[PDB]
Design an enzyme around this catalytic site. Structure first.
Site, PDB file in Angstrom:
ATOM      1  N   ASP A 169       0.659  -0.991   0.244  1.00 50.84           N
ATOM      2  CA  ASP A 169       0.260  -0.296  -0.602  1.00 50.84           C
ATOM      3  C   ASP A 169       0.401   1.373   0.114  1.00 50.84           C
ATOM      4  OD1 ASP A 169      -1.759  -1.860   2.326  1.00 50.84           O
ATOM      5  OD2 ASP A 169      -2.406  -1.404   0.453  1.00 50.84           O
ATOM      6  N   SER A 225       1.522   7.007   1.572  1.00 49.20           N
ATOM      7  CA  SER A 225       0.231   5.820   2.729  1.00 49.20           C
ATOM      8  C   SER A 225      -0.943   5.569   2.098  1.00 49.20           C
ATOM      9  CB  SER A 225       0.717   6.350   3.883  1.00 49.20           C
ATOM     10  OG  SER A 225      -0.453   4.984   4.938  1.00 49.20           O
ATOM     11  N   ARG A 226      -1.100   4.443   1.414  1.00 48.06           N
ATOM     12  CA  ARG A 226      -2.498   4.650   0.743  1.00 48.06           C
ATOM     13  C   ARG A 226      -3.926   4.854   1.301  1.00 48.06           C
ATOM     14  NH1 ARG A 226       0.817   2.353  -3.144  1.00 48.06           N
ATOM     15  NH2 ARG A 226       0.175   2.143  -5.619  1.00 48.06           N
ATOM     16  N   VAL A 227      -3.391   3.816   2.828  1.00 46.88           N
ATOM     17  CA  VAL A 227      -4.734   4.128   3.577  1.00 46.88           C
ATOM     18  C   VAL A 227      -4.648   5.499   4.402  1.00 46.88           C
ATOM     19  CG1 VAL A 227      -5.284   3.450   5.781  1.00 46.88           C
ATOM     20  CG2 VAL A 227      -4.002   1.590   4.899  1.00 46.88           C
ATOM     21  N   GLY A 228      -3.456   6.547   4.195  1.00 47.10           N
ATOM     22  CA  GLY A 228      -3.530   7.762   4.058  1.00 47.10           C
ATOM     23  C   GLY A 228      -4.164   8.352   5.467  1.00 47.10           C
TER      24      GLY A 228
END
Ligand code: ATP
Ligand code: ATP
Ligand code: ATP
Ligand code: MG
Ligand code: MG
Ligand code: MG
Lengths: 434, 114, 478, 383, 380, 52, 104
Positions: free
Chosen positions: C319, C344-347
């Site tokens: 991610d 960060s793809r969750v962010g």
């Protein structure tokens, strides 16, 4: 006596129940549309030879009879080939009858051995001022021609042919290795127009033998056509005793063709992508161009540099063999100077005072220094002013401006469309003039 | 054309011949007849040097090699499966496969006697 | 089965006709194996150990079982090799249970969205590229950046949080050491002991002298030891140190099993090698327990060249990405995090809410710092607000620096970025912003850290109290 | 098919011999009627299975040594590189267009050797020791191996004697010991050959002023050059008188890549005669970067896996086992020396090339010759 | 032991069992009848996969000869080896199984050429795909034809007007030359080609019948919707009265995408050879090159640079040298090629791009930076 | 019979120098694959090799 | 190319219905010259190219305005008032990029 076993592209396996033909021997496929000549590349074992075709293999059946000629590819040589066009296997493709063969010579040959070589290292006077002064030609050397389109390359080719036949009485071979057929036909008709090739009854007064292996021919035919031109030149050297000119048109296409036939025979490619035998497949051609005790072959080979990269292995292997470069420039040709030889980027190995003498060497280095001194102030004239700097700087401007004019010269094959009569210039007159 | 099915399956190009030689010997109930036909050729290579030269030497002509085997496997000891196998193996020069086509023939034979 | 041939850690085995693909086999020398490519004439067996004890004609017995490792809470505290067996000299693994190393990852219906935060204690990570529980995050960098040091700080910090959280939300860490030195991993067991993180840590150690199938299989063994905590409602943290050294161990077996090479020499299935493994890091649904497994694969690049084969595979799988730069490392910026390339793809979904509202401004200013410093290092001209952004972004760059083994909890991280983004660290000299912010944590009252830990957010009744407390501090330089 | 199961087939298990005796009375008459088509069988001789790319596969030759001169019946030499179970792969010192399948190969009983001695002094030979200058065979000479191992640690001493080159830049700035190895590395046409030629001419000038043991006998190995260049160089060495002390080994650009690979070893075996009998030798491998290219050709035609740039991986060992024979021997071994000048052409000044950085980490120093100093007329263009 | 020399066998044939099988099974006393595998003009598929069939037998097939499978799908005998034929399939190889019968058709690859091809959209083998019936006023011609020699040609003198100002001013193009339209993706290469074809439609109505120029567009590797949009534009303009379209799309087999430029050149050589004037446009000769590389790697020919065969230069030079201007004793006709080569980020140092630059006369280099500066056509 | 183990040392009888061969692989047909510690120039294909 | 083409040529509007396809395409190292994106570029009527440089500026959606093309960008399809504003926006964003090497 042998029969076709495999046909994979241009690569044919032939099986012989008797004894095998030698490597490099020529085989005739008996029964086909056209004459299909194969050249034996290797003995694969189990009585199979592996061959590389000189024409198309489409239409070839496993079991077709194949006749071994007992020799390599054999081409007609002599004065009867002058003004004719041959393909790689010796057939006339100029559609003007057969070829009057003095002899029929094998195109495969060892280089003239050490006892036959010349140790003299002398200059070939060409009658062109910029070529004789700044970048002289070794008699027996290889000369790279960095021309192109519209820089008057073909006029320079025909004038080297004309002046060498006029002065030294030697004949010329043009090996069109992998040339386009439109360009090859243009050069043919331009040679007929300029009088270095004559048709009909005046055919014996031609100065040039064209050997054309075209771009639509298979890689085996483009890879061997330079050897056919070499054989035609070696007859004039070794039997006629002449100073021959050979023109290998695009030596890079010779390299690329031999790389293709090395790739098709399943060999692992070496550096960047080339054949593993690149240095020896190039040196087998270039070492037959030498001075023997009989005569010489001087080779003018057009050089293409692949990605404008001189460290690419095909020009880096070619430049080991070259004895001179004559760079033809577009910027020289857009000052109306003809021939368009760049007087500063052209080099020669013959330019040192131990082969041409201190007189010729110092005249050439003075001319080259004066043109260089003018060259690195043109960003000072165009920026700050023409009459801005000194009188001595403008003295070198005027002297190099008139030397830069003086390198131009009217050409004898150009007079049939320019009117101005061409003028052969001798070497001592060129030295005393400059 | 479907043959008898082999008892056990085997790997290729030398046991693939034995799988077929077994199948055209179980069609005529010649499974035990062609087996000692094979064993006699194992023995003939131990005796004769010009017979094993037709399986190792690559310089014997294939015209010779297919006409020595065809000109000695006549009028005695033929079995017409042995006689056609060793003239097929001499066509392609595969007479050196005679040792391992024999070994994998037994492994079909021994699984046929259960 | 009979050994036909043996050499280079591959034994070609005749027979073994009922062997499964991937099945453990046992040689009569005692050394184990794994049947990897079943062929019509032989079995290709990669050897779990030294192949000098295997001879031609040796007997190979099949164990009947696919490759499995002991999982459970009895692995906590212990240092095992590439398959389970403990190498720390403390006897057998009591209180443990075997399970397969190649388990299918949980599918779509077995997950839920990554919402709980995973605090690493590294404020360059916990502010700018935050990490949720169940998220896999690549720590990619060049040769000696701070890659292990980011991952060791994420493990040591879980020890500091496990003492403070209830028993359900404790994170149990697994460090997989692939292809490293054996004394390099002995320095980490010594570090995890004297910090105390070894109470919660499993170390799966397939060093450089282990066989190439033991280093290929050790990320799967460590994932299986960490999937115990995911599957039973707890939370795991797996760190695969140098997946780029696992793929070299995989390339060695694939080239010696004569599988045909592809890019650089790697097998075709080397994307499937790592995506089989990283997809096992998941946040499970509440029907399955709500458990979680957070991965940190480490990839080493060569010259900052992330365009490599194994590098572009794991960038495509994970991610986020924590890209560490060797030129930022030597400028003083340690952790050497490239804030312009780290994602960060969750962010903002799973970060601290107390720092979601502060580190939004932090990356908004550091994005403005980057392009103005490319111009102002030529030294053309400056503009009194362009002068503000390269003077403020230097306050933030020095703020995100950190020492080696001191993870900062989450509340002392967000107070420090608060004091750096709410202007309290302007007119403080840039050399001791790294030295001012110990005063901003020590002199500010220790009970204001409890409120921001319990709320998890800067309430309106707290920013007015905290910015009153960030004024009664004695800053150096000033 | 297990070897346990192929071992039981040595024991007779036919249990019926009704066609053992049938063909064993018929096999010999059927073989006899095909004797016109039998080539004579080959055991200690060899027969060429397959020739191509300058590598022949030879059936038989049961007792050839690895690395041995074999002789094809057309008089072309070869070297048995790899003895296999079924064939011998030989490497053809010549053009393979004269070798056929079915040709006879003869073992000569000796590993690849060249004529060394006082009688090769003055002569121009090819890469295998046969003279090409046309003045007859090599007389007053003896045969010695070309792949001798270099002397060990205890057989050497440090270089002390000063080996004058005659070049002011070299003798002042980059001075040459007498058992040293000095790389002359530069681009194309930067005066690399000229330094080595000047060293050979200076040894001619110094050999007539020193007493018989401080004389230096030069060897010029020209690998991959043109033959006209080698003819001009022999003319220069003859007219200066330097051919009295020089051996000239040449495997030119037209020659086979085995001959270009082997010619520095031939010249090194000829100069090791002067090293081993107490005298001093000078050896110049001109374009060792062309011997590396010929060895790369041989390796890719042998289908060995290419490494960096395409080179076989033992192309370091190729030049290291060559240049390690340039030594200064101890007083118990005579005290002779051999000074090497490898020459490496560099492309556009790239010193970080493969073969360049190989030979730099073999030789004791370097002489860098720059194009920017050579174009300005600073000649020798010594960096 | 004196039997060690026969311990392991060596075989000169992977299909040894295919020879032993046709000599062992007819030797049983039942099967001397009626079951002999015919091998002279017939074959059996040994292997099939990825559009390559290895066929046993077919002893009298010619190299490059069109063969037919018993499921109707055609193929070309491309590898002729000692024991088998490698056949490239002109369709999907899903219908082909091991043991399928392969018949030889006796002919090398043919294409219907003639005046009946005008207005028709054919596939890569000449069969119409527009659904207007068979080709009517045609005759079969070979696909691999020898290019005209030195003496068959004459110098290029007559202009071929493309209707594009940048081209006809700066890069003047003659009837009989080969101009390479080289550029990156979406830079206007097809737009220059289509403007040339449409302008020949405009010029053909005002010049005499001896000077009209008949276009052929070869669409290699494009999608069928793009070809349908192009046929729609050619019909709404009126260019289909002079244009043939040879369309081997992306879903077609790799041998069809390989053979579409050769088939379209065979259709346009009708106009070259009978006095008239041709304009052939090989749109994405890059994709034809990729298709030929596919067939040659699947036939296990030795790969060279980037993966390509040795004769990938010979492929395009043999194709493109058929664009000539003939001599007056051959009708004076001509054929003008516009190969289209896609570059990747604008390098003319790629392998097939260097090959076609070496083959063609000029080039028209369209630069993608000039495209969004407003300059359209984006001619560098 | 009874192949040497991998990494075992083997001595070649009758070489000009002492030639030690370290066993690297078992090739599969009672054949071991060895690495020479000195030069192999002079090895004939029947030479007696002694396992140590 | 043939595997990709055999997939892509089934996603078509026919005379029976229509399939409007939206395919994400990963480029391996921000490299549009890799053969797997470069093969699929020829199959798409509208290729939206997203760039890393646009994303690091914070412009989201990070669509490269110059590199994104469509076959619907003809003036006889979407009108001239749309076509000329799109081409004008592209020209202003292009000569800004030509200025941007001198602003920096
Ligand atoms: N945040 C930090 N502050 C100061 N020093 C650091 C920091 N992180 C790492 N270092 C130092 O950098 C060196 C390299 O760290 P680390 O061991 O993490 O490298 P690495 O990226 O793991 O590379 P490798 O895997 O090759 O060891 C260590 O010796 C450590 O002392
Ligand atoms: N010291 C010098 N003074 C004057 N001229 C020189 C000197 N050295 C060399 N030259 C000239 O430079 C040219 C190149 O010399 P040389 O042949 O020694 O270079 P090279 O490195 O061998 O080139 P290549 O390897 O391509 O043959 C020769 O023509 C020679 O005349
Ligand atoms: N002269 C022009 N003026 C305005 N737009 C143009 C012009 N030429 C081309 N275009 C536009 O450029 C887009 C791409 O052009 P085109 O498809 O013709 O080039 P291409 O290089 O063949 O692209 P591809 O390789 O993707 O097929 C088309 O949408 C077209 O509308
Ligand atoms: Mg580390
Ligand atoms: Mg030199
Ligand atoms: Mg297009």
């Amino acid at each position: 006596a042998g029969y076709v076993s495999q046909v994979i592209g241009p690569v044919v396996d032939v099986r012989f129940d008797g004894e095998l033909p030698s490597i490099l021997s020529s085989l005739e496929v008996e029964g086909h549309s056209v004459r299909l000549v194969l050249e034996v590349a290797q003995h694969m074992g189990d009585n199979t030879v592996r061959c590389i075709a000189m024409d198309s293999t489409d239409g070839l059946v496993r079991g077709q009879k194949v006749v071994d000629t007992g020799s390599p590819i054999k081409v007609p040589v002599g004065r009867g080939t002058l003004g004719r066009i041959m393909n790689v296997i010796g057939e006339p493709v100029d559609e003007q009858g057969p070829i009057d063969a003095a002899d029929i010579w094998s195109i495969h040959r060892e280089a003239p051995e050490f006892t036959e070589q010349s140790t003299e290292q002398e200059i070939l006077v060409t009658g062109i001022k910029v070529v004789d002064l700044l970048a002289p030609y070794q008699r027996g050397g290889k000369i790279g021609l960095f021309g192109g389109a519209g820089v008057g390359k073909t006029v320079l080719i025909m004038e080297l042919i004309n002046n060498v036949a006029k002065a030294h009485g030697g004949f010329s071979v043009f090996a069109g290795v992998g040339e386009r057929t439109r360009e090859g036909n243009d050069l043919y008709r331009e040679m007929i127009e300029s009088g270095v090739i004559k048709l009909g009854a005046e055919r014996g007064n031609s100065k040039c033998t064209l050997v054309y292996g075209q771009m639509n021919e298979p890689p085996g035919a483009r890879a061997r056509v330079a050897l056919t031109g070499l054989t035609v030149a070696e007859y004039f050297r070794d039997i006629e005793g002449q100073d021959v000119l050979l023109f290998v048109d695009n030596i890079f296409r010779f390299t690329q063709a031999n790389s293709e036939v090395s790739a098709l025979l399943g060999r692992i490619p070496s550096a960047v992508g080339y054949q593993p035998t690149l240095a020896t497949d190039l040196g087998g051609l270039q070492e037959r161009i030498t001075t023997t005790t009989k005569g010489s072959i001087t080779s003018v080979q057009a050089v293409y540099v692949p990605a404008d990269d001189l460290t690419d292995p095909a020009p880096a292997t070619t430049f080991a063999h070259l004895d001179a470069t004559t760079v033809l420039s577009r910027s020289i040709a857009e000052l109306g100077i003809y021939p368009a030889v760049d007087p500063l980027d052209s080099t020669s190995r013959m330019l040192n005072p131990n082969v041409i003498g201190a007189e010729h060497y110092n005249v050439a280095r003075g001319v080259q220094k004066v043109l260089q001194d003018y060259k690195n102030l043109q960003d000072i004239i165009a920026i700050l002013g023409m009459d801005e700097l000194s009188e001595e700087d403008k003295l070198t401007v005027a002297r190099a401006r008139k030397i830069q004019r003086f390198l131009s010269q009217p050409f004898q094959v150009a007079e049939v469309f320019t009117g101005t009569p061409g003028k052969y210039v001798d070497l001592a007159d060129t030295i005393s003039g400059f | 054309l479907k043959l008898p099915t082999a008892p056990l399956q085997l790997s290729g190009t030398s046991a693939q011949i034995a799988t077929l030689l077994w199948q055209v010997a179980a069609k005529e109930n010649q499974l035990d007849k062609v087996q000692d036909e094979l064993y006699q050729f194992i023995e003939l290579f131990k005796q004769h040097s010009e017979l094993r030269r037709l399986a190792t030497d690559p310089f014997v002509p294939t015209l010779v090699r297919t006409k020595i085997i065809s000109s000695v496997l006549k009028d005695s000891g033929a079995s017409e499966i042995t006689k056609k196998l060793f003239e097929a193996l001499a066509d392609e020069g595969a007479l050196s496969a005679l040792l391992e086509v024999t070994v994998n023939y037994e492994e079909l034979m021994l699984a046929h006697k259960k | 089965g009979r050994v036909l041939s043996v050499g280079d850690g591959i034994a070609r085995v005749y027979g073994l006709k009922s062997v499964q693909a991937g099945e453990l086999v046992c040689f009569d020398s005692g050394v184990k194996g794994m049947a990897l490519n079943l062929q019509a004439d032989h079995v290709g067996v990669v050897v779990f150990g030294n192949d000098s004890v295997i001879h031609q004609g040796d007997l190979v017995y099949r164990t009947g079982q696919i490759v499995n490792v002991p999982i459970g809470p009895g692995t906590l505290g212990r240092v095992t090799d590439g398959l389970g067996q403990p190498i720390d000299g403390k006897g057998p693994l009591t209180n443990v249970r075997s399970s397969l190393v190649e388990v299918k990852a949980p599918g779509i219906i077995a997950r839920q969205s990554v919402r709980e935060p995973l605090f690493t204690g590294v404020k360059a990570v916990d502010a700018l590229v935050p990490i949720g529980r169940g998220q896999r995050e690549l720590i990619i960098g060049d040769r000696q950046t701070g890659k292990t040091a980011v991952a060791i700080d994420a493990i040591i910090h879980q020890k500091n949080c496990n003492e403070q959280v209830p028993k359900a939300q404790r994170v149990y860490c697994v460090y997989v050491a692939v292809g490293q030195k054996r004394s390099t991993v002995a320095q980490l067991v010594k570090l995890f002991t004297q910090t105390g993180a070894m109470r919660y840590t499993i170390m799966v150690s397939a060093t450089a002298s282990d066989a190439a199938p033991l280093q290929f299989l050790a990320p799967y063994s460590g994932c299986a030891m960490a999937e115990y905590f995911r599957d039973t409602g707890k939370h795991g943290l797996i760190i695969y140190d140098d997946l780029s050294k696992q793929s070299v161990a995989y390339r060695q077996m694939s080239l010696l099993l004569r599988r045909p090479p592809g890019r650089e020499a790697f097998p075709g299935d080397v994307f499937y090698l790592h995506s089989r493994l990283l997809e096992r890091a998941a946040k499970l649904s509440k029907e399955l327990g709500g458990g979680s497994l957070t991965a940190f694969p480490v990839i080493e690049t060569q010259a900052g060249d992330v365009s490599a084969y194994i590098a572009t595979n794991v960038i495509s799988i994970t991610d986020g990405q924590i890209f560490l730069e060797t030129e930022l490392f030597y400028k003083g910026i340690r952790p050497a995090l490239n804030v312009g390339l780290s994602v960060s793809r969750v962010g903002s979904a799973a970060q601290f809410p107390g720092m979601k509202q502060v580190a939004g401004t932090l990356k908004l200013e550091l994005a403005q710092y980057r392009e103005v410093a490319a111009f102002a290092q030529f030294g053309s001209d400056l503009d009194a607000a362009t002068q503000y952004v390269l003077e403020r972004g230097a306050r933030l760059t020095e703020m995100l620096k950190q020492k080696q083994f001191a993870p900062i909890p989450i509340e002392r991280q967000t107070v420090a970025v608060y004091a750096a983004t709410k202007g309290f660290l302007d007119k403080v000299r840039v050399q001791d912003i790294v030295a001012a912010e110990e005063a901003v944590i020590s002199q500010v009252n220790p009970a204001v850290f409890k409120i921001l830990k319990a709320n998890g957010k800067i309430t309106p009744a707290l920013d007015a109290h905290l910015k009153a407390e960030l004024r009664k501090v004695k800053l150096p330089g000033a | 098919a297990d070897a346990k199961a192929l071992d039981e087939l040595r024991k007779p298990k036919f249990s019926s011999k009704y066609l053992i005796q049938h063909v064993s009375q018929k096999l010999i008459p059927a073989v006899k009627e095909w004797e016109k088509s039998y080539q004579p069988p080959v055991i200690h001789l060899g027969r060429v299975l397959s020739v191509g790319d300058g590598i022949a596969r030879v059936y038989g030759l049961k007792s050839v040594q690895a690395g041995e001169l074999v002789c094809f019946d057309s008089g072309v030499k070869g070297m048995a590189l790899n003895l296999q179970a079924d064939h011998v792969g030989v490497v053809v010192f010549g053009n393979d267009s004269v070798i056929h399948q079915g040709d006879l190969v003869y073992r000569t009983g000796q590993i690849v050797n060249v004529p060394i001695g006082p009688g090769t002094l003055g002569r121009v030979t090819d890469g295998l020791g046969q003279p090409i200058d046309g003045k007859g065979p090599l007389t007053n000479v003896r045969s010695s191996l070309v792949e001798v191992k270099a002397p060990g640690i205890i057989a050497r001493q440090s270089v002390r004697e000063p080996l004058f080159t005659g070049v002011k830049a070299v003798d002042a700035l980059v001075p040459i010991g007498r058992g040293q190895r000095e790389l002359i590395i530069g681009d194309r046409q930067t005066g690399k050959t000229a330094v080595a030629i000047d060293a050979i001419i200076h040894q001619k000038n110094c050999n007539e002023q020193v007493p018989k043991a401080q004389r230096v006998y030069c060897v010029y190995v020209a690998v991959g050059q043109k033959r006209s260049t080698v003819a001009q160089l022999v003319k220069l060495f003859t007219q200066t008188g330097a051919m009295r002390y020089t051996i000239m080994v040449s495997a030119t650009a037209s020659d086979a890549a085995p001959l270009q690979f082997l010619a520095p070893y031939s010249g090194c075996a000829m100069a090791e005669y002067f090293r081993d009998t107490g005298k001093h030798g000078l050896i110049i491998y001109d374009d060792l970067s062309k011997q590396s290219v010929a060895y790369r050709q041989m390796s890719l035609l042998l289908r060995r896996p290419p490494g960096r740039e395409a080179f076989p991986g033992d192309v370091f060992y190729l030049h290291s086992r060559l240049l390690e024979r340039a030594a200064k021997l101890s007083k118990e071994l005579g005290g002779g020396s051999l000074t090497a000048f490898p020459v490496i052409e560099t492309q556009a000044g790239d010193v970080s090339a493969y073969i360049a950085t190989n030979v730099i980490s073999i030789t004791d120093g370097q002489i860098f010759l720059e194009t920017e100093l050579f174009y300005k007329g600073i000649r020798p263009a010594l960096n």
